[PDB]
Each structure stands twice: as C-alpha cells, then as structure tokens.
C-alpha cells in the first residue's frame, strides 16, 4: 500500500489535513512534516484511507479501459501492484486475480504471459490529481471518520453525515456530466437496434 | 527467486510507457537502459520522463528497427551515499528512520536480486542469461 | 427492448447463482433484490401517440 | 521531506492501525513481539474477518474445476482447514470432511484412485484481496474489535453504517467482475435462445 | 453425551474458544488445558452445546441417508448412542425410538434385530469437521449465548444477535449451494410427472 | 548457517528441521523439487509443528514426482515489519527488528550461490543438467 | 571491493587492507596455496593499524601459499549495535546499525560475481572456463 507520509507535502494535501483537523476543532498546522502531532498524523492516515476508498469505487475519469499490462520478458510475470484498486476484463467475466502479488489467470490457472494483457484498471492517484468535487468528498468523508474515531461528537457526526451526502451527490453530478452517457446512441445494445 | 528490482519489457516500437513495480527512494536510483545489440542507458530528462511515480514515459519510441528488442527498468540504490545521516543535535523523526531503514533494505534487496548480473535459475529450471552474450568463452572441448 | 437486470447491492441475491442455475433450481435470494430497468415514459408516450 | 519517493507499507500493519484507529488508539509501529494484546487481538480479528468474508463465495475467489490429488499410497485426499468451501462442480455436492480427509458421503469412502474435481474456496492472504474487499474486511474487523474490546455504542452505529457501505461496494465489485448475463451467459436460457 | 474436554485441543477449537472469550472481552488463552480458567471452561461447554445443537438441525452435508446400523449377533441389540443427534427412517413415518440406549421399533414393539436397519441418521461430528461457514455460525451463536449467560452486556447482545442472523444466513446459502436442489427433475414427485 | 537447504524426499518422512532464524512464518518458503517445482501452502500442505520444524500434511516422494524438498528463507523487502509513525514512542525493539529484517535479506543475499552455476574442482562452470537460455 | 590479494615473495608483512570493516573478526586472512590455510589472528597477523595488517612470518612463494587473501566476512548473526531502551540514542549507533547490513550486502555483490559476473561491456565475462555438463 502506497506510503502517504513519505513524499513532499502538496498544498492541497496540507489543506486537506487542516480541513480534517478543523472538523473536531483542531487548529491548522503549517506543515505536514513530523512535529509529534498525533492528531495531524491521524488525519493524514484517514485522508489516505478515504482517498483509496473513493477512488476504488470506479468513475469514468479514473477507470482506465483497454490498458495493456506488460510482463517481464524473462519471468513472464505481470505484477499486480497494491496500487491497482480494481483490475477487470474489458468485457464479459473477469479472469485475472491477485495471487502472490502477480496477475493470475484463474480460468487458465497460469501466471505466465508471453504478451501484455488488456484490462480495465483503476490505479491509485494522488489526492492532488482528484477533481475538485472529489477532493471535497474525500475530505468530507475523512473528516466524518476522523471525528467518529478520535472525538466522537454526536452533533458533529450529524452535520458531517449530511455534508458527505451532499458531497457525494455533487460527485455524482460530476460523474454524469463527465460521463455524458446516452442510452440511445451511447448504449452498447440499443445503438445497434437503431439502424434502419 | 524472481527478481523484483529489475524489470525488462519488450520493445514494440510504438509503446513508450513502462510500469515501475519496485519501490525507490530517488528517481536517480531508477536506471533505464535499452537492450539489443548493445545496452544504451537513457538520460533522466532528455530520453525519458517520470510520467507518474510508477510510470516511465520514453520521449521516443524504440523498437527492433532501432536495434532494441527490450527496455530495462532497474533500481540501483547508492551504497556510498546514504540519504539519511543522523547528527548529535538532530530531532529523531519517523520519516528519517523510515528512509534510513528502507535504503538499507533496497541495498540488501538489490544484492539479493543480483542473479540478473550473473547466470541464475529463472522461474523454470533453466539458467538464464537474460539476453546478453557470454563473452570470453573461447575454445570448447 | 434492452433487458437490464438491476441487482440491489444491499441485497443478498447473487447473479452468480442465478445464471448457473438450471430451471427448477432452488437458490438463495429474495425477489425484491432483483429488479429490471424500465423506461418510465408512458405519460409522454400517450401524449406522443 | 526531500526526494520524490515511491515506497510502500505492509498492508496488514496498515489494516491493524485502521482497526486501532477505529476505537481511537494510536497506531503501532510493529506487529510482532507477542507482548501487545492490542496487536494480538486486532490481528486475530482481521484474520477471522478475512477468513469469513472469503468463505462467503465470490466469482474471483471461487475456483472451479480444481483437482485435488490423493495420496499415492493411502489414497486419502486431505480436507484442509484452509478450505473455506468445498463443493462439487455441478449438482449436489458429495464430499464432506471426515477426520481431516475428503469423504464421499454417497459412496461412503475416503479412498480415491484418481484426483477429484471440486468447486473450492481456498484461503487467500489479505494482500491478495481486491481493494474494496480489503476495505470491507478492515471495516468489519474494526466493527467487531470495537464490540469486543472497546464497547462504545456510538462507535457501533458508525461502524455499522460504514460496513453496510463497505459491503455494498464489494457487491458492485462482484457484479462488475462476474459480468453475468441472463440471456446468453445463463446456463439454461442460452439454450432456449437457439433458433 | 460426548466429552468435549477430554481430548487434545485442535487449532480450530482453540480458535473457537478464544473467539467466544473475545465476545465479552476476555483475552485469548494459549491452551484449553486446565489452568483454572473458569471463563475458558465455560466457553468450551457452550461451544460444545452449540456444536451439538446446530448439527442436530439437519443439513445435506451431515444428514447420512441409507446408513446401516448393525446389531450385535448374540444380543440382537442396536445401540442408540447419545451421539445420534437424529435418527429417522429413510422414507415415510419413522418407526425407531430410543429405549434404554438401544434402538426400539415402536410399531413392532421390539428392540431385537436379526439384521442391520437402514436409517436416516445425523451423527455428531467434531467442530473441526464442520464447514467454515458452519464453524462461524457455531462460534457466533456460542459467543452470543456466552455473553448472555456470563456477562449479559445489552450492547454486545444486540450486535451478536445481528451477527448470528448473518451467520445463519450464510449457512443457509451454503446448504442451498451444497444441496443443489431442483423442483423439476430433482423432485421426488415432479420428476415422474415430467415424463412424456 | 545457511538460509537455504534441501532435504531428500521419502514417503516415510514428514518432518523437516529449520536451521535458520526467521522473523515471520511467511518468510519461510517450502518447495517440492522434482521434474516440476511446486510451492506449498502454509496450512493445506504443511504446518509448523514447532518453531524449528515443518510437518507436511501429506508424505511426498518419487511416486508423487518430487525427490527433494527445499526450505528457503525469503524475508520480505517491500513489506517491512517495522514502520515508524510520527508521534509514536520510539522503542528499541522497533529499531532492532528493522535492523534484523535488513540483515536477513542481506544474509539471503550471500546465499545466491545455490541458485547459480557454481564452479567445479577443476574450476569450470557446471550447469547441473540445466539449459542456458537467452 | 571486499576481496583483494597480495603475492609477495620477498620479506614483507604489511598489507594495506582496502575495505572498511567494523570488527577485527570480520577480516579473515587466508593463504592461497595448493590448499587454502585459514590463519588465526593472535598467532599470525597483528593489526599494526586499522588500515594495515602485519602478517607474521614471510609466508612467501618459497612456501606453497604464495599470495595472501584479505576477505571481509561481516557476521549476520552478531550485531555490533543492539539498541536498548534507557540508553541514549546516539547518532553514531544509528549510523553504524545501517552500515553493518550494507557491508554484508557489499560482500554479497562479490560472492555471486566471483563464479561468473558481468563486465563493463554489459556482457557475462567468462574467465576462460568451459560450460561443462550443459544440457541441450
């Protein structure tokens, strides 16, 4: 699992942590570098956990379709990184699983590939790379879980529950606007049915 | 057994993005070399790019027409130059302790994965030369 | 004309068991968990017709 | 922090820290030494929940047509403790566990000349689970850890909501991975579709 | 009634008892050997009780149909052991009861048999011999009863009530998947009706 | 002293001793060597009867197709047993375990000679009936 | 490099050891003759300086041993730095703790390369040895 605390702090990640800290009434921190601040370290850990969780759900902007994963030419192994939040087939039933940290074809019972496989994959991205609406939802959900675990204030719980629902709604609006899905001509089955 | 610090991919002449599975402390610790008739090492910012922390993007597409069948991604962590050096007056930090431990692990890991620089058993029961010449064999009998 | 089986993810019925079943098979599940996408345009359909 | 690093952390230690964070406790740096009851309890629950969720049965983890070879001399097939589910490939299952060995209840025999083919679920590591399934295991583990070793009832309601969402996202993963179709993917209707 | 505490502990039985102990927040024990631990001894007794109770309910995997019980050649008695959780006839109304620890034919009013009888029998099995889902249900039900009897925590009662229902549900899913029951051709009556 | 050692297989035996020190049980890898190489699983194929021995659930031998068993220590490099967290009490046990884990990988790093050609008494390069590829 | 040799027929004892070592037990001195002789420290060689080893006796090619091998073998089991709680954490001890593993890794990079290695041309440089018992 990718280390969240081992790289440079971005402005957005520092802002995200300060937003999470504010949810229980903690004052903002100037830097994310270790100053023995347990609350900030707890906030960043939940921020990473929520960042992985919402990205793993799958969205049009973050689902990579038709990606080729290449094997090692001398070991014929394709690595299944822990940063692969979801690995699927491009169509039909999926056949690839994680076995020992490498891609495994469960139908053929083999982990050896002579050529790249084409998969529908979600790869973990930085919180900085998320759309603004998705960043807000991640922070809102992280703030809600942060308050639940380390403060537990019931009044804060109720408001953050409402804010997450609104934040998820606005991410749902982003998903459809980005998606541009059409059931007539953008549909896999119906589009063929419209030919006269 | 299976090397995790050296990754080599087939060069098709049209793909320029290659995955980095292994951990690394610095982008300089990642060495990109094109293999073929010769082993040509690439430069950090003129021959390739770190598109993401796990992805290397070549500036130019290389293939058998260029004389390069494979591309190799290998971690070479510095042994003489440690990234973390503790001083008598310095606050001990979790990040500093993590980096010092991980660099030592990577140096040990690169040593344990040195079957690449020799003839070692691959996944099958075969000794693998990994696409290089056994020079100076000279006469045989 | 498109048949889309909507499976409630809060439910307990698995299409893995539904598709592998033979006719007459007894399978765990609840009929409420399985639904189908339906076009709801009858009011507009009557106006257009 | 200098340098643009790319390093990982062990998922089990991260999972345990998520379970400990759920009840408000500081994370631990390590999970060995056998002298930490929090580490022992959280790790045990995480293994218990990981084992339990895998035993439920999913398209990615139900291995179909797996052959289990008997011993050449005793003709016994070991029924492993790590066999979360063992069933026949089709119809009614006929194999049960009898004294740690596969037993054919219909023929009443532990002896097998050749290997049997079964639909088997074999325990996998928490590392080999999909990210959504890792999240559900951690959330479910955090829920029972609070119920057994913290006991705060406001935490219970929160973790009940989280696990319900964690299971729903796992259910969406099952359908996306399964890719099931009642017209052509169906075992029975596909035959009825031939003209 | 089989003694639960007189044999060597298995790893699964050690795991089960510690899971039951965890339900009220008791720390795990290294062994089930006598250390004067009243809580662990109580947990094992409830574990055995729930193990007998769920197995006696009857499932395709543990219901043995067509089993022959042989009599003693010189006494003509077939023993009705306490490990027979259920003993039925293969079809129709059952005729065999327990009378003095031996099989008794209530219709013929005799306990003497010249040859083996064919019965539908449930015989007690080790908790180690249970399917994984059934082991989880046994532990969940044992943990619920353990808390009710020896701690009585009402918050723990509610959660284990929900856990048992989910545990029983997944055991019902196992039993249907294991059974593979068909009302068309696997049916005793309807399959005859399908012949043209 | 060796982190990798091999035992000959007979149908009689199921117990094999571990000479080396391992931090975790998953660091020990059990493999059957014959015409085919097969990695064993922690519980279905074997177990840890004690800290220093492995008992196979099934006996193996020439009839099964494997004449030798290999007990190898593979300490994890990516998954480290110690990760120092900010605001955590710095314990000497954490520092020692981090030092031992890198030691174990480096100790296995000086045992690649078994997975290499090796030299003869004459000083040649002895491929133990193995083809050389690539 | 962790392995180096000196061949000195004339009367000489001093050998400047190139590799850095943490303990004197890590440096092992052998005599490469018809059969190798492992030499104890007290009887055979003194550390005149941390950089220089003064091997008692000539031990020249007049005897069969000819050249002398200076090998570094860092002990994996024994740790020079063992952290204990209640002891001042020293920057020196934190630094040396990493170094011992690195020294073992350095010794590993030479043991594998000894039997066969890779030259500066990116090719596997044989020493003029036939590939015997090779299977087709």
Curated annotation (Swiss-Prot), chains A, E:
Localization of this protein: Virion
Cellular-component GO terms for this entry: virus tail, tube
Chief site of localization: virion
One example of a Gene Ontology biological process annotation: symbiont genome ejection through host cell envelope, short tail mechanism
This protein's UniProt keywords: Viral genome ejection through host cell envelope, Viral penetration into host cytoplasm, Viral short tail ejection system, Viral tail protein, Viral tail tube protein, Virion, Virus entry into host cell
Superkingdom assignment: Viruses
Record InterPro entries: Tail_Gp11
Self-association and partners: Interacts with head-to-tail connector protein gp8, the tail component gp12, and the fiber protein gp17.
Family (UniProt): Belongs to the tail tubular protein gp11 family.
Function statement: Structural component of the short non-contractile tail. The tail complex is involved in viral genome delivery. Forms the 12-fold symmetric toroidal domain immediately below the connector protein gp8. Once the tail tubular structure is formed, the interface between gp11 and gp12 generates the proper environment to interact with the six fibers, each made of gp17 trimers.
Protein name: Tail tubular protein gp11
Organism of provenance: Escherichia phage T7
Lineage: Viruses, Duplodnaviria, Heunggongvirae, Uroviricota, Caudoviricetes
Curated annotation (Swiss-Prot), chain B:
Leader peptide range in chain numbering: none
Lineage top rank: taxon: Viruses
Subcellular location: Virion
Function of the molecule: Structural component of the short non-contractile tail. The tail comprises six fibers made of gp17 trimers, 2 nm in diameter and 32 nm in length. May attach to host lipopolysaccharides (LPS) to mediate primary attachment to the host cell.
Assembly description: Homotrimer. Interacts with tail components gp11 and gp12.
Membership in a protein family: Belongs to the Teseptimavirus fiber family.
Protein's name in the database: Tail fiber protein
Species, as recorded: Escherichia phage T7
Range within the parent protein: 3 to 143 of 553
Curated annotation (Swiss-Prot), chain C:
Protein localization: Virion
Superkingdom of the source species: Viruses
Record-stated family: Belongs to the podoviridae portal protein family.
Subunit (UniProt): Homododecamer. Interacts with major capsid protein. Interacts with the tail tube protein gp11. Interacts with the terminase large subunit. Interacts with the internal virion protein gp14.
Function summary: Forms the portal vertex of the capsid. This portal plays critical roles in head assembly, genome packaging, neck/tail attachment, and genome ejection. The portal protein multimerizes as a single ring-shaped homododecamer arranged around a central channel.
Protein name according to UniProt: Portal protein
Organism in which the protein naturally occurs: Escherichia phage T7 (Bacteriophage T7)
Parent-record interval covered: 294 to 342 of 536
């Amino acid at each position: 699992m990718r280390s969240y605390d081992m790289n440079v702090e971005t402005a957005a990640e520092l802002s995200a942590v300060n937003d999470i800290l504010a949810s229980i009434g903690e004052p903002p921190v100037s830097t994310l570098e270790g100053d023995a601040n347990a609350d900030a370290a707890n906030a960043r850990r939940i921020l990473n956990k929520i960042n992985r969780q919402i990205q793993s759900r799958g969205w049009t902007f973050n689902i990579e379709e038709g990606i080729t994963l290449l094997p090692d030419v001398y070991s014929n192994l394709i690595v299944y990184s822990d940063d692969y939040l979801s690995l699927m087939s491009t169509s039909g039933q999926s056949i690839y699983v994680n076995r020992g940290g490498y891609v495994y074809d469960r139908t053929s019972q083999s982990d050896r590939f002579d050529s790249g496989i084409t998969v529908n994959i979600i790869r973990l991205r930085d919180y900085d790379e998320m759309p603004e609406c998705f960043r807000y939802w991640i922070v809102t959900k992280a703030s809600r879980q942060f308050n639940n675990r380390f403060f537990g204030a019931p009044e804060v719980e109720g408001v953050l529950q409402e804010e997450e629902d609104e934040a998820r709604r606005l991410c749902m609006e982003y998903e459809m606007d980005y998606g541009g899905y059409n059931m007539l001509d953008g549909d896999a089955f119906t589009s063929g049915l419209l030919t006269r | 057994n299976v090397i995790k610090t050296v990754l080599t991919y087939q060069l098709d002449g049209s793909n320029r993005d290659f995955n980095i599975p292994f951990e690394y402390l610095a982008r300089k610790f990642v060495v990109v070399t094109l293999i073929g008739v010769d082993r040509k090492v690439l430069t950090i910012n003129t021959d390739y790019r770190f598109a993401t922390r796990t992805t290397i993007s070549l500036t130019k597409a290389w293939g058998p027409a260029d004389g390069y069948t494979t591309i190799e991604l290998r971690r070479v962590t510095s042994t003489t130059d440690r990234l973390v050096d503790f001083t008598d007056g310095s606050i001990l930090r979790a990040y500093d302790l993590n980096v010092a431990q991980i660099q030592t692990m990577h140096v040990a890991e690169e040593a344990r994965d040195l079957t690449t620089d020799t003839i070692g058993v691959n996944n099958d029961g075969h000794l693998d030369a990994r696409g290089r010449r056994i020079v100076n064999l000279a006469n045989a009998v | 004309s498109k048949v889309i089986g909507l499976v409630n993810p809060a439910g307990i019925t698995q299409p893995r068991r539904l598709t592998k079943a033979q006719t007459g098979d007894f399978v765990t599940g609840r009929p409420e968990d399985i639904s189908f996408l339906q076009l709801e345009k009858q009011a507009d359909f009557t106006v257009a017709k």
